[PDB]
């Protein structure tokens, strides 16, 4: 895309230690798959693109970007070691938005009923086998 936009996070890379876990498993099969067909999540499902939607400043602000496009193609091609690292990237995600936006935006609400699946879904995250 734009050259004004950065390069997205990495999704591969053959020097990163990469396993499957049971709990790595959970995350794509249930906690992604859930979050990906809800309603609010197509604003989450790509990086942000800075120039379409006229925000010269986002990647001032935000220097950690993340993404469940991003999270999505991790998780498929096993790029994680354990379920912490994503676990990580949505709450990299969410907290993004959180510190960008306004409170009551409607990409906050968006984002708060994203977050609020991912914690009960997180909560029953299984023990690792
Ligand atoms: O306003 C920032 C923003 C825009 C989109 Br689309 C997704 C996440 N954050």
Same mark, same amino acid.
């Given at each position: 895309?734009?050259?004004?936009?950065?390069?997205?996070?990495?999704?591969?890379?053959?020097?990163?230690?990469?396993?499957?876990?049971?709990? #790595?498993?959970?995350?794509?099969?249930?906690?992604?798959?859930?979050?990906?067909?809800?309603? $609010?999540?197509? *604003? $989450? &499902?790509?990086?942000?693109?800075?120039?379409?939607?006229? #925000?010269?400043?986002?990647?001032? @602000?935000?220097?950690? *970007?993340?993404? /469940?496009?991003?999270?999505?193609?991790?998780?498929?091609? +096993?790029?994680?070691? +354990?379920? &912490?690292?994503? @676990? &990580?990237?949505? %709450?990299? /995600?969410?907290? +993004?938005?959180? @510190?960008?936006?306004? *409170?009551?935006?409607?990409?906050? #609400? /968006?984002? !708060?009923?994203? =977050?609020?699946? $991912?914690? &009960?879904? @997180? %909560? =029953?995250?299984?023990? !690792? !086998?």
């Amino acid at each position: 895309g734009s050259h004004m936009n950065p390069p997205p996070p990495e999704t591969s890379n053959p020097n990163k230690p990469k396993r499957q876990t049971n709990q #790595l498993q959970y995350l794509l099969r249930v906690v992604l798959k859930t979050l990906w067909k809800h309603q $609010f999540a197509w *604003p $989450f &499902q790509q990086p942000v693109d800075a120039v379409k939607l006229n #925000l010269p400043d986002y990647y001032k @602000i935000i220097k950690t *970007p993340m993404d /469940m496009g991003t999270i999505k193609k991790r998780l498929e091609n +096993n790029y994680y070691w +354990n379920a &912490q690292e994503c @676990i &990580q990237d949505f %709450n990299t /995600m969410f907290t +993004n938005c959180y @510190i960008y936006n306004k *409170p009551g935006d409607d990409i906050v #609400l /968006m984002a !708060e009923a994203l =977050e609020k699946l $991912f914690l &009960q879904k @997180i %909560n =029953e995250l299984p023990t !690792e !086998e």
